[PDB]
Amino acid sequence: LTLNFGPQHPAAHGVLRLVLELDGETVMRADPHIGLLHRGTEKLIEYKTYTQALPYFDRLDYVSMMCNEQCY
Amino acid sequence: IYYLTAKKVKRDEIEMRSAQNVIFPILVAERDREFLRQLRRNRDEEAELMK
Amino acid sequence: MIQLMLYSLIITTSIIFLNMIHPLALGLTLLIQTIFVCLLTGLMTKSFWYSYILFLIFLGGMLVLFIYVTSLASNEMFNLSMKLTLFSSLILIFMLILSFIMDKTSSSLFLMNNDMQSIINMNSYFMENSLSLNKLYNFPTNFITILLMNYLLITLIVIVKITKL
Amino acid sequence: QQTLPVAEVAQNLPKKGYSPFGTKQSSVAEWSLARLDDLLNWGRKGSIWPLTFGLACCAVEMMHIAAPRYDMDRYGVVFRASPRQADVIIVAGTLTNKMAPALRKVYDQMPEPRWVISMGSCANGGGYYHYSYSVVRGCDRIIPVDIYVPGCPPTAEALMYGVLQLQKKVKRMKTLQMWYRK
Amino acid sequence: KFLGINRLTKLFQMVREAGGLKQAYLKLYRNDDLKIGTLVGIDKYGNKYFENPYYFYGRNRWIEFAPHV
Amino acid sequence: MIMILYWSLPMILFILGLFCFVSNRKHLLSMLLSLEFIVLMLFFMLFIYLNMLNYESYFSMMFLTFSVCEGALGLSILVSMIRTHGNDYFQSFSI
Amino acid sequence: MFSIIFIALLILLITTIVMFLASILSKKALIDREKSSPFECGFDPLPFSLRFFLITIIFLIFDVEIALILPMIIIMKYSNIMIWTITSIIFILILLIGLYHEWNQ
Amino acid sequence: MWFEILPGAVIITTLLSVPIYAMYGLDKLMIGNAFRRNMDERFSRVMYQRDFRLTDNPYKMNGLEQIPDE
Amino acid sequence: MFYMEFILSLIGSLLLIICVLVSVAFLTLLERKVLGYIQIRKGPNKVGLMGIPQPFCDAIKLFTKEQTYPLLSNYLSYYISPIFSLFLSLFVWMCMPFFVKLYSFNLGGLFFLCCTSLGVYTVMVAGWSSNSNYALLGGLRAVAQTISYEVSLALILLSFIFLIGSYNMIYFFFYQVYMWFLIILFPMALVWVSISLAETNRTPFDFAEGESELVSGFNVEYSSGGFALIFMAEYASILFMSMLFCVIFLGCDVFNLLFYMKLTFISFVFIWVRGTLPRFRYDKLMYLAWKCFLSFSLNYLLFFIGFKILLFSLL
Amino acid sequence: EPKDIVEVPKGYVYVNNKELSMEFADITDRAASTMFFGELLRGFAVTLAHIFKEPATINYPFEKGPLSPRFRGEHALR
Ligand code: SF4
């Protein structure tokens, strides 16, 4: 059974697409498909200055805000 | 406590069964008289129908 | 009267069981036949124990295997036809009005119920579903139900071997 | 705009009432259809079930109306995971190019009436990735949107203000009056 | 009190301070909770701002809007 | 007569289920479901027999146990060909 | 039992009438290609499992076994006590030994 | 505060108390006897049959006034 | 045969059905309210007055939305699952112990086991006809857990029938005239709570119909009236399990208002375990249903076989 | 007090490092907690104690939550 834990699914974080092959309840294979929330951050940093690219890191890992700003 | 409750339920159903055994033979005699009478009318009806 | 209604319903479900071919639809026809068979065997008997036993064993216990296998066997849905529904309804109304125009005393079954027995019958007043089930748990017929439980365990041993797990 | 009415002026104003249509309908059939539409809109605004569609950071505020301080459950609002059982889809996050057919299919499998709330600057207008190669310039090009909540992470009072504005839109829905005038 | 009987007369004086039982009914129907508080402000638009530090933070200040709407 | 008016219908439906069991227009799952249809009709006729006697109805769960073990045996025979004959063997019209 | 048929047919008739009136009261919109599609999360799209089938078979064997444990509450006041106790203790003990043996193997 | 649950629960206590209590009124209205006759044992069914044979209402009493003077 | 028996049986059954349905609506209100109070948050409010007509807001909305279908051509098999689900949930209530006679069910436990054995059938037609792999997985998982605790439930109720000596539900009243069965059967009380949260899909046994591992097990394609009938059927099953806990363990007390207060309290307990416990797994639930509960069932059935033999000599 | 499987250093803290106890008192305590749902009873009691707590629902829009003077909202031209 091929199955999609797609972006609608709540155990996924809203953009994960887990294409998983199932023999019964067991998971024989699980390929994560990502890039559904790819926003082209590294292409957009180079067209802006340092203080303009500082708010990108707040939106990168968005449960760790001040740590990302601290790292940048 | 369940043993005492089951003893109470047992004596209640034994009281009901003894009352049933009292009521029973009068109703048996009444059924006997009606059964013999109905057998007589059934034999008479079968005799007059099959002439 | 209601015995003739169950006769008509069993006839109608049997002829549509003969007509249809989709395997889950035959499974649905079996599960709705089992209810009418349970009720109709309940009309002849003193009490409804064996209808309940047939119900738990056959419908809720065994036919769920058939429903699961026939559900995973067929990918497609039912193709409902209004012609077969109309023919089943027409033969059902015809058989109910045929039971209306027929004497129900001659068509009733000769098997005695709990109230069709004599009033002076001592055995009927004792306890509901007591004397019929008595021979299951008395000498010398208890060896058959011990052999039946052993037979069910041996059946499970057979089934594990033949499916190969 | 209009100046909000001064209390000297507003004391002379009568009460608005619950019904936006008013009870001054002429025909008895038109009045009956107006009250039936009022009851239908009250039932629809009394419980809207939004869908668990959280794409990006905005959704971290979306759970913050689930949170005990703001408490969306006393507004008829409770999350449903399946798109069939849900009324509303809240686009809360960044719709990308790989995300577009998934959002369109999830919206199309939702049953009508379908109100859509765009939560956040990535949901409406593209926002902070508006000039990106793989970000759709707002979700208005794909899914038709009824309420647009403005803030980059909308505060949760502002998202719930969008929810109350959607409830006012649902209360203003005219279906049976339009059927009588069709 | 240990049991909480003295909150019933607080509910009763809430009813009397609302203006009766019908006015308390339409206050409970409109404002989702019944509260007492010191009247702090009245706008030119007719709103009424009440404050009472008995409640916890976030609930100690409330608006009651103008009664023409 | 007695056979025409009483217990005629289980015979007719038993022959109908037997003809559904052996017809070439059906498949193996239809054979098994028609087999349990004649199991139900056999229970009907056996209960009509067993209720002429008063207190011998306890045999009805013996035949039930044997025929239910037959049905589970037939299903476990039929699904044991899934890993060998594939999932398309349920549509086989011939053996 | 004849009243049970009447009340069950009335419950079935009331539920079908309520669902028919719900289908009338449901808002009829234009039917679509994607709206009729089966729901897979997001992007659009099982074999036979033997373990669940033997779960159903174990359920069936234990169900037919329970159908022989069912009568003996009534028979306890109307049978030989020694025979009834021997059959009940043997019945549940062989069931427990079989369950523990299938657990260990 | 926490007493707002009791609007949603006590009503549940009332409604499910309806289908017996109304019958405890209603059997006192059209029958006159508050309890319908129990049909579990066969002897109760036979004696109920005897009552419905004796009077057209089986819950109507045939007391000692039925007995003729002798 | 006297016709007022039929008339009053019909009136009492229809009144029972109506009151059960309105109690289902108010049970959904109670669950949304106190399930909020399980956490810090409030329950429903702001609709009508103090959130009371919120289930009527649910009922107006669910009976108006577009009845969508999992496929466009043939969908009559999609209809037959909520009809039979609500039919069984309103039909199982006929074996309630009524002291004023409504139906003389001398075998009520077998009737309850029959309706529970159809629960698997309505959820199996719920799973298959919805044409989705999530729907088939949820239907197979629900059929798996319900037939896994069907055997356990049959053995537990079969152990309880040994105490009263018959299958008549009103015989639970006469054996509870001095004390409740909660005192004597407290591990059976915990096991029966674990049983009653398994046949009806609640949070402790929610791998069948959860929102985490599946989006929805068998309500995934059901909406706009079918979901309303399924939801009402499941909450009627919750009400039936609360009543059946209150008859067996707590004294039947059918007339007293304290019985219905305890029924609302056991519904409160059902919503109390709704907010507390996490969800079991498939392997751990096969371990629970077939080894622990089965071994406890057979062992304590042996205990009551010995106890009912010991009291039979003494009485 | 169970013994340590791994010796805990000065700058670190170890979780699930306790040995499983083998004396009969601790085995009977763990057995009674397994059989009679003691830890589930503690979880149920902790859950039920939060019904009696004050709700934190701030009743929007009659009462609005705290803000700050630095708060960023609608841009405006002074
Ligand atoms: S609008 Fe702002 S907060 Fe929302 S997803 Fe985009 S960057 Fe994040």
Author numbering:
A (entry chain S2): 85 to 156
B (entry chain AO): 53 to 103
C (entry chain 6): 1 to 165
D (entry chain S7): 40 to 221
E (entry chain AN): 3 to 71
F (entry chain 4L): 1 to 95
G (entry chain 3): 1 to 45, 51 to 110
H (entry chain A1): 1 to 70
Give verbatim excerpts from the published study on this entry.
Initial poor resolvability of the average Dm-CI map around NDUFA10 at the interface of the PA and MA led us to perform focused classifications using a mask encompassing subunits NDUFA10, NDUFA5, NDUFA6, and NDUFAB1-α. This classification revealed two major classes and two minor classes of Dm-CI particles that differ in the presence of an ordered α-helical element from NDUFS4 bound at the interface of NDUFA5, NDUFA10, and NDUFA6 and in the angle between the PA and MA. We name the states the NDUFS4-helix-locked (helix-locked) state and the flexible class 1-3 states. Overall, the helix-locked state and the flexible class 1 state mainly differ from each other by a rotation of the PA and the tilting of subunit ND1. According to this measure, the helix-locked state is most like the closed/active states and the Dm-CI flexible class 1 state is most like the open/deactive states of mammalian CI. Although the density of the NDUFAB1-α subunit is weak due to flexibility, its position in flexible class 1 is consistent with the formation of salt-bridges between residues D146AB1-α, D149AB1-α and R209A10. In the flexible class 1 state, the N-terminus of NDUFS4 is disordered, and NDUFA5 slides along the surface of NDUFA10 such that R92A5 forms a salt bridge with E302A10. The TMH1-2ND3 loop is well ordered in the helix-locked state and partially disordered, though to a lesser extent than seen in most CI open states, in the flexible class 1 state; and TMH3ND6 is α-helical in the helix-locked state and contains a π-bulge in the flexible class 1 state. In the flexible class 1 state, the C-terminal loop of NDUFA9 moves away from the TMH1-2ND3 loop, providing space for conformational flexibility and both loops become partially disordered. Second, in the flexible class 1 state in which the PA and MA twist to bring NDUFAB1-α and NDUFA10 into close proximity, we see increased flexibility in the TMH1-2ND3 loop, and the formation of the TMH3ND6 π-bulge is more consistent with the open/deactive state of CI. However, it is important to note that the range of disordered residues in the TMH1-2ND3 loop is distinct and shorter than that seen in other open/deactive states and the conserved Cys41ND3 remains well-ordered and hydrogen-bonded to Tyr134ND1.
Respiratory complex I is a proton-pumping oxidoreductase key to bioenergetic metabolism. CI couples the transfer of electrons from NADH to CoQ to the pumping of four H+ across the IMM. It has an ‘L’ shaped structure consisting of two arms: a peripheral arm (PA) that extends into the matrix and a membrane arm (MA) that is embedded in the IMM. Our Dm-CI structure contained the 14 core subunits as well as 29 accessory subunits, for a total composition of 43 subunits, two fewer than the 45 total subunits observed in mammals.
